Ligand binder design. Structure first.
Ligand code: GAL
Ligand code: GAL
Ligand code: GAL
Lengths: 518, 518, 207
């Protein structure tokens, strides 16, 4: 429209209908010029990397992008409480995105003194990758999200991507992408941008914990009509061999026949937060579970979903097998345990093997009169028919969706870090300040212009997501576990601003409070 | 609309119809950035407070708000005179509010020299809390009103609020509010804002004084048919006991039967403006009437409405029991009596007990041949059926409405400081300059941006209130008391500007001049 | 429950335009008398003018569940709040709704002023505190006076050059205009309705 008109309004609320929740978030952003308007080849060579496991090849772009892919972008802590205490499930449905009130600014420096002024004719350009033709970086859990607290102003992160490498080198199959080779909308102050998106059908996240365990599903009062082998010897001494059979029943539940078995396992090393209980060695990398791809070792960072500890063992956690969030102000490198927050998957204990335990035991031989029966431990167990499992829980600090990789086959493509896997996730939204040349020379020169006006932009972003709810139908008589604030006096309010103005999230909050039968 | 068009006009007049008055006020405001765009936890610890009675916990916000809640915002002194001399009652009916001609400005400092320029693309954001979802601070009598004199330019006050505390700490029941989590309208120069409001039904304020007193309502010429106990002894000496009864009549009015009794009382300590008549001790706090809430003592600052002094005792005033206004230029702390203006409620003397007197006397025992009759003084008297009272008078300097607290029960929820109590008062109007980041760094950083362009806004506000009038029907023969200016020569005109340009209000003006029968 | 208290409803950042009497003497010594006035503001919140005051009070005796803190006497009936009807004394068993204790004082409870439920299998007569369940009204602390405290203080005299200012404690306070209160909370074990007695008049007939 024009210089003097606002191109959009602040809309931050949430709206609870019967089976639907509509979250709306507005934030203020700032976009720098990245890479001096250049595309740059980057690799572990350009960054000085060494180990082959860390080698990479790729490109950094002048562009930047929006990430709303964490839940605290869309939910206040109160809204999150309201979701998790009342609902068995939820999934995203629709998306609405807006860019408005764009302001492009010019920075001039004289001597040690900078002046900022509006550049009214400068433009910002924006496009969504709707055909998913770019490397999708939103499914890796990155910084640069919209801030959880609506009054914070955030920097837009720089877009970059990786392609195939051999060491620091690239192969011929490596692909380079110019983001200028897409059509994009150009925006002066007074222009706005919007688009809508439909989430594809995704199952409801399970926001409940089971009130039954998979090995306890029997009627405790009644025998089975099945028999098991109770006794193989008639007693001490030579040549005592029998087959004795007993009814499996209430008194021996471990031996009863069952129709369903716990889900798959890939075993994690167990680490105690009580520190003297740990070995006196460096096992962090060496003792870690990992998978290998093309000679590279990638740590298996989230487990396949697994229970983080056994009952009462809460001090234990799987080495890499859980999500670790930092507290507010926690540094980058080598921080103590009290400065991070270790998620635990304890609720899926009912259907899922413990991350730090063997799946079970198998027979390793044929017994005989000569040979005793031998068993061995199953350290990793793939899918078996009859397995049943829960996915990893999702967190207010955590990711929402991932892009399912485009491949011939996948199994149960729920993202291992948690959330909703999608073949066509919310598309990437790319934004860039268009370069404005400084004064060119008065004689022609064929070289590309390397001299530009120093410039940055700011504005507002609205994200509106419609969420579908699955209500609790339970007949449970006794009251349930719910997420609560604690009444006891404290210097600060949890999930509130500091005395210095710093918003913090004191604890990770999962979704699983309400219960269901198994 | 656009940069070059005015978005509204100055409208300041008042319009007197038959039973309606419409006041319109326009002022010029300036809005700073508050708190460097931050929410801040505040408490008596952050301010250094000590006593438990003064302890608090709360938040200061970057937002600011409009307060038109004093009468001098809407009434010129002449209009006020015209209201109070001609009318038995008035109440507010409708409200219309406008923000227009917004100007956002940028401040740059080089060395000891500041330059102010327009920022044409910057925006201001505004919303009303229509659902009363925020702590309501307009019902406490605060500075920051629209100025009584239309040519004065005023600063918008900063919005803050308190929640539950224990000492300086907060409890889990304490609530934090982000004002960004409301939808608000964004305004560039050329955008304007308006909304309308309907006052809910409120009784007319009583702008009259009674021409009768509650104990004089009888016919002075005629006896009662009731009898009272005149004499209990037949004379001096032993064993003189009788019951003698007399007709209550014109000669003894104190003893007549009456149908209605004066309203409730909570006794205030009496202070003389003649200073040698006061005790030589510090009684201000120690001798003060107070109420206790959760171990805190709050001074009972306005009385329940009560008469400020007896007849001819005008030098006396209740310790806290009246409203005290400062004169123009009166300082903050420890000022002499001549620099303030002490309101008196003298007109309600007819139906209301004197603030500094006991309500009356009650029997404390059973008399008998052994025991003399004993009485005691009633220092505080709650509501009794048959009580009748007037509310506190309202003032041109004083507040208009309060928000009735949201509770299971209340009694006669007329605000004790005076005015119109409402469950849904005029809503809070919140305004903020939207933060404009300075130049961000060219490498991504996840920290919220703490560097902003220094900025402030100005504009105009219109408030239009429709007032309903209640005319005088009186049959009184003799002329009445009216508010007047005094003809005698003076250096300045009252309610006019100074020789230095300073507007002042020389006296508090109540509403009660005309009379009614009781 | 209220997230604000009735005495904290102000804007903490802004002064009042009202004044209060801060100082009555100019100092030590004879014949020091002044009237000094100050703005009520963020630093002194206790003295600010307010539009609404806490609800009515009828004072209850305070009993500690820590037993050595109680007096060594039988006060159960003798120290109890009561009302009289036709020469009969009825213990005032539920208070008019009032806050059961001050902050952090949870060990205290009003003598009769709260509902006491028995646990399962609790006997009829003279049972220990661990066999009953003492309700507390702590949430109404924001608008309601504490059951075991005085409502406040009133002036009992006229001060003068001869007489110092005297105050006295208000043990019971009836309704005043401008009072605001919460009703007693309701419980899963508790009653639902009552019949309002059929009478000429009643006030706020919440059971
Ligand atoms: O290969 C050895 C290295 O492996 C890395 O993945 C690990 O983070 C390092 O600590 C180091 O042990
Ligand atoms: O508690 C003692 C104090 O109480 C305050 O409310 C009063 O304003 C002070 O003057 C001081 O007397
Ligand atoms: O009047 C004296 C009696 O009063 C009763 O109401 C009380 O329950 C008894 O314990 C006893 O003290």
């Amino acid at each position: 429209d024009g210089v003097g008109s606002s191109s959009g309004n602040w809309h931050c609320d949430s709206q609870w209908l019967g089976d639907r929740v509509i979250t709306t978030s507005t934030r203020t952003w700032a976009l720098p010029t990245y890479n001096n308007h250049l595309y740059k080849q980057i690799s572990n060579s350009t960054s000085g990397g060494s180990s082959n496991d860390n080698a990479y090849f790729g490109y950094s772009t002048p562009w930047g992008y929006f990430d709303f892919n964490r839940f605290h972008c869309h939910f206040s802590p109160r809204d999150w409480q309201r979701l998790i205490n009342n609902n068995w499930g939820f999934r995203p449905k629709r998306l609405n995105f807006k860019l408005f009130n764009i302001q492009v600014k010019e920075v001039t420096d004289n001597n040690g003194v900078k002046t900022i002024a509006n550049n009214l004719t400068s433009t910002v350009q924006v496009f969504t990758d709707s055909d998913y033709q770019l490397p999708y970086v939103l499914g890796s859990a990155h910084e640069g999200c919209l801030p959880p607290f609506p009054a914070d102003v955030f920097m837009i992160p720089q877009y970059g991507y990786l392609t195939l490498n051999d060491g620091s080198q690239a192969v011929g199959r490596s692909s380079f992408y110019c983001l200028e080779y897409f059509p994009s909308q150009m925006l002066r102050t007074g222009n706005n941008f919007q688009f809508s998106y439909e989430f594809e059908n995704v199952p409801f996240h399970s926001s409940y914990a089971h009130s039954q365990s998979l090995d306890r599903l029997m009627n405790p009062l009644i025998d089975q009509y099945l028999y098991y082998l109770s006794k193989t010897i008639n007693g001490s001494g030579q040549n005592q061999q029998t087959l004795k059979f007993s009814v499996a029943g209430p008194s021996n539940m471990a031996v009863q026949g069952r129709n369903y078995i716990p889900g798959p396992s890939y075993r994690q090393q167990r680490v105690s937060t009580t520190v003297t209980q740990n070995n006196n060695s460096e096992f962090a990398w060496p003792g870690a579970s990992s998978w290998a791809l093309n000679g590279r070792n990638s740590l298996m960072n989230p487990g396949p979903a697994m229970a983080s500890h056994k009952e009462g063992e809460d001090r234990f956690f799987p080495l890499s097998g859980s999500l670790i969030f930092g507290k507010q102000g926690t540094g980058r490198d080598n921080v103590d345990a009290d400065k991070v927050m270790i998620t635990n998957e304890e609720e899926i204990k009912t259907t899922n093997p413990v991350a730090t335990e063997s799946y079970g035991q198998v027979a390793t031989n044929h017994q005989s009169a000569q040979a005793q029966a031998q068993t061995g431990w199953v350290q990793n167990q793939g899918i078996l028919p009859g397995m049943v499992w829960q996915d990893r829980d999702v967190y207010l600090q955590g990711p929402i969706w991932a892009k399912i990789p485009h491949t011939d086959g996948n199994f149960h493509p729920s993202p291992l870090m948690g959330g909703f896997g999608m073949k066509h996730p919310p598309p990437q939204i790319l934004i860039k300040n268009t370069p404005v040349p400084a004064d060119p020379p008065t004689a022609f020169n064929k070289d590309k212009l390397n001299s530009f006006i120093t410039q940055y932009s700011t504005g507002q972003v609205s994200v509106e997501i419609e969420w579908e709810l699955q209500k609790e139908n339970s007949k449970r008589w006794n009251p349930e576990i719910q997420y609560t604030s604690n009444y006891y006096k404290s210097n600060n309010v949890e999930f509130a601003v500091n005395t210095e103005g710093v918003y913090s999230e004191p604890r990770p909050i999962g979704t699983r409070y309400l219960t269901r039968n198994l």
